[PDB]
């Protein structure tokens, strides 16, 4: 896979900082490119992290798997610390589309087996059922990456 950590074994001091109101799940893509969950960060909290150069991270709502940003973009890979200075990862909400944001709220209020008992267009039921998925996001991101080459 294009989307995976490099096994550089070169350490990199990192700060995860959650400037989202969500509980954040950091996700590490391993050497095979499979996502590994790491302990969650409460909203407003940060901590120092021992990672390595070339290692690939992304961030999600720990409850809903909603997608989040890190340094204004989707993936995080740290360079070598320059003379041992930590690398900052500023985790935030993205500006969701009003559609996606409304999907979030309705999901939070309705059991999935009741989606189809809402008085709405048939097309939105599918949209509601289409939960945010780390695996689906990776296929979307992988194709985007292949288009830069």
């Amino acid at each position: 896979p294009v989307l995976r950590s490099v096994n550089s074994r070169e350490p990199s001091q990192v700060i995860f900082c959650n400037r989202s109101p969500r509980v954040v799940l950091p996700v590490w893509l391993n050497f095979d490119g499979e996502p590994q969950p790491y302990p969650t960060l409460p909203p407003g909290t940060g901590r120092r992290i021992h990672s390595y150069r070339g290692h690939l991270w992304l961030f999600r709502d720990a409850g809903t798997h909603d997608g989040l940003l890190v340094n204004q973009t989707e993936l995080f890979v740290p360079s070598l610390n320059v003379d041992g200075q930590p690398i900052f990862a500023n985790i935030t909400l993205p500006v969701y589309t009003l559609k996606e944001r409304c999907l979030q709220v309705v999901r939070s209020l309705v059991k999935p087996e009741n989606y189809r008992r809402l008085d709405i267009v048939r097309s939105l039921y599918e949209d509601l059922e289409d939960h945010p998925n780390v695996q689906k996001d990776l296929e979307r991101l992988t194709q985007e990456r292949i288009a830069h080459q």
Binding site: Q72, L93, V95, T97, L98, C102, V105, V106, L109, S123
Partner: protein, 97 residues
């Protein structure tokens, strides 16, 4: 700063910045010329279906979106009351935003 008028189904007039209103793909098309010739570009859009409580909330989104998109300054949650969630979702879908 050109403005435009968005009229709700119950006759409420919302005047918003044109660049803000363009957040909607549906509105961008309705304001922009017929097809590829950008002429007889209009200045009002009427929504026979969307009521005032929903179009007001939609316009708040356009402001939020412009202000916070591509912004280095930390981004807050866009708030939605349960009571408007279903109607707002249908608007959003209709408006492509």
């Amino acid at each position: 700063m050109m403005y435009v008028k968005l009229i709700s189904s119950d006759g409420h007039e919302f005047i918003v910045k044109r660049e803000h209103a363009l957040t909607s793909g549906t509105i961008k098309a309705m304001l922009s010329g017929p097809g590829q010739f950008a002429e007889n570009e209009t200045n009002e859009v009427n929504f026979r279906e969307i009521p005032s409580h929903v179009l007001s909330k939609v316009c708040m989104y356009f402001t939020y979106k412009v202000r916070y998109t591509n912004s280095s300054t930390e981004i807050p949650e866009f708030p939605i009351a349960p009571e408007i969630a279903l109607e707002l979702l249908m608007a959003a879908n209709f408006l492509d935003c």
